[PDB]
Design a protein around this ligand. Structure first.
Ligand SMILES: C[C@@H]1O[C@@H](O[C@H]2[C@H](O[C@H]3[C@H](O)[C@@H](O)[C@H](O)O[C@@H]3CO)O[C@H](CO)[C@H](O)[C@@H]2O)[C@@H](O)[C@H](O)[C@@H]1O
Length: 216
């Protein structure tokens, strides 16, 4: 068992141990790896390659500024991926590609400005968390294939209701009011939680006429 970690069968728990990098010696039979709440500043190319039976991976609350290309390619059985509370800005376009069975994707509280490419194809997603980033909008159709969504976290983004290309997210929240969630120390259903930048007005209440294709 790795230094400053605890191991119980297939669970490897290294949360809250001031790790400055992913620790060597992680058992390859591990199905759950808690690495959240450290100050891991980078992931080494290949760091997870050996862990091909991994099902849940938590990397929340670290110092991740970037993800290496293919860092998650080995984890074809992965169902939970938590990346919330890092310093992420841009992701590699195919970083989620192999995660065809992913059900929970947590990415809150980073510095994202566009929806990361790939999210569109993760059809088994039940949870998707994008709250507290810097997204101005959502590309048209990005949620079409995500027909298993029960929780969507969209609050705390500078949504741009001036632009007509908010109308997808507008329409989408109105059509899925029940999966629209805010966070009150837990999950709370709130179709209004997603709000326009500046005005603090609910995104789903945005009117077709109130927008302009020439103000984006
Ligand atoms: C750190 C936390 O981040 C936001 O809370 C989000 C919440 O984070 C979970 C996190 O996934 C979990 O690994 C950690 O151990 O506990 C957090 C709960 O506090 O996850 C939900 C979605 O599941 C939301 O995205 C939350 O926004 C932030 O809102 C909290 O204040 C807190 O800083």
């Amino acid at each position: 068992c790795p230094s400053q970690c605890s191991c119980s069968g297939t669970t490897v728990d290294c949360r809250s141990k001031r790790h400055a990098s992913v620790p060597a010696g992680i058992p390859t039979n591990a199905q759950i790896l808690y690495l959240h709440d450290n100050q891991i500043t980078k992931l080494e190319p290949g760091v997870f390659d050996s862990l091909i039976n991994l099902k849940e991976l938590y990397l929340g609350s670290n110092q991740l500024g970037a993800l290496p290309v293919g860092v998650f390619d080995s984890l074809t059985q992965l169902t939970v991926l938590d990346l919330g509370t890092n310093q992420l800005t841009v992701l590699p376009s195919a970083v989620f590609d192999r995660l065809v069975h992913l059900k929970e994707l947590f990415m809150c509280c980073n510095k994202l400005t566009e929806l990361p490419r790939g999210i569109e194809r993760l059809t088994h997603l039940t949870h998707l968390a994008l709250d507290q980033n810097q997204l101005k909008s959502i590309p048209h159709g990005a949620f079409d294939r995500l027909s298993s969504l029960t929780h969507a976290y969209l609050f705390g983004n500078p949504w741009d209701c001036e632009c007509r290309d908010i109308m997808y997210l507008r329409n989408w929240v109105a059509d899925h009011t029940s999966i629209a969630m805010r966070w009150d120390g837990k999950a709370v259903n709130d179709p209004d939680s997603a709000k326009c930048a500046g005005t603090n007005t609910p995104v789903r209440a945005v009117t077709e006429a109130s927008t302009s294709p020439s103000k984006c």
